[PDB]
Design a protein around this ligand. Structure first.
Ligand SMILES: C=CCOC[C@@H](O)C[SeH]
Ligand SMILES: [Zn+2]
Length: 256
């Protein structure tokens, strides 16, 4: 279902009718209309870098998958009364620097977006179980602003040369993806979804107030990943970021 136009995000509603749904992501975050809430607690990431397993090229993006067999890597606080388990981080990016981030704040589009994904291990057995569940997934979203080169992106960008093409796997160990997060975990939260098929309406978004930085060259790496299988003609992975979607009257909550 890629991000072309043949497979691209307009074609998503055919196969996945949930695309023209009510809890679709990303969204625009209109700060004027955002109802501050104080029942919210502060977000608290406790990741353990020995959970870091693998980095894999999945054709449309690349993942960094984590060990999700126990509660060693948890997110808790925010709205969540439960304690979600970390399983993955990945990125979204765009063809040019001007766009690339999925969420937008007051119409402003960013270079890329980081997703640090979690699944509700207090209520569910597997990721596979919690994938589809309303209270299934907790994803931290960081907005990535084109400027200085982020030195905490090092290990991620280094490893990329070993997963040039779709399906390529490699061990990525000994990394806490919290080091990626901004210093201010002031956050918006809203009831969302995945941003790509199967677009499950299972995500409680945590969108960070403060941005992290990425140079144009760091973004050029993301782009010089290849969507093709090894041997085939080099088809870069140019953009993998979704249009912002109607709120249909959900209430983005501030935590600031
Ligand atoms: C399957 C990977 C992670 O899914 C959670 C979403 O926040 C990524 Se848009
Ligand atoms: Zn994502």
């Amino acid at each position: 279902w890629g991000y072309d136009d043949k497979n691209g995000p307009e074609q998503w509603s055919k196969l996945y009718p949930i695309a023209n749904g009510n809890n679709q992501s990303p969204v625009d975050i209109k700060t004027s209309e955002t109802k501050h809430d104080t029942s919210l607690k502060p977000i608290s990431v406790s990741y353990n870098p020995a959970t870091a397993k693998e980095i894999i090229n999945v054709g449309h993006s690349f993942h960094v998958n984590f060990e999700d067999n126990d509660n060693r890597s948890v997110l808790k606080g925010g709205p969540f009364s439960d304690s979600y388990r970390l399983f993955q981080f990945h990125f979204h990016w765009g063809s040019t620097n001007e766009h690339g981030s999925e969420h937008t704040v007051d119409g402003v589009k960013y270079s890329a977006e980081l997703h640090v994904a979690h699944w509700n291990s207090a209520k569910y057995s597997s990721l596979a179980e919690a994938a589809s569940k309303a209270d299934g997934l907790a994803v931290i979203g960081v907005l990535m602003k084109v400027g200085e080169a982020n030195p905490k992106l090092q290990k991620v960008l280094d490893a990329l040369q070993a997963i040039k093409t779709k399906g390529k796997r490699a061990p990525f160990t000994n990394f806490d993806p919290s080091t990626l997060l901004p210093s201010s975990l002031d956050f918006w939260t809203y009831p969302g979804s995945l941003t790509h098929p199967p677009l499950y309406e299972s995500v409680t978004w945590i969108i960070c107030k403060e941005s992290i930085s990425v140079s144009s060259e760091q973004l050029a790496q993301f782009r010089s990943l290849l969507s093709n299988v090894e041997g085939d003609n080099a088809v870069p992975m140019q953009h993998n970021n979704r249009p912002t979607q109607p709120l249909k009257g959900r209430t983005v909550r501030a935590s600031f």
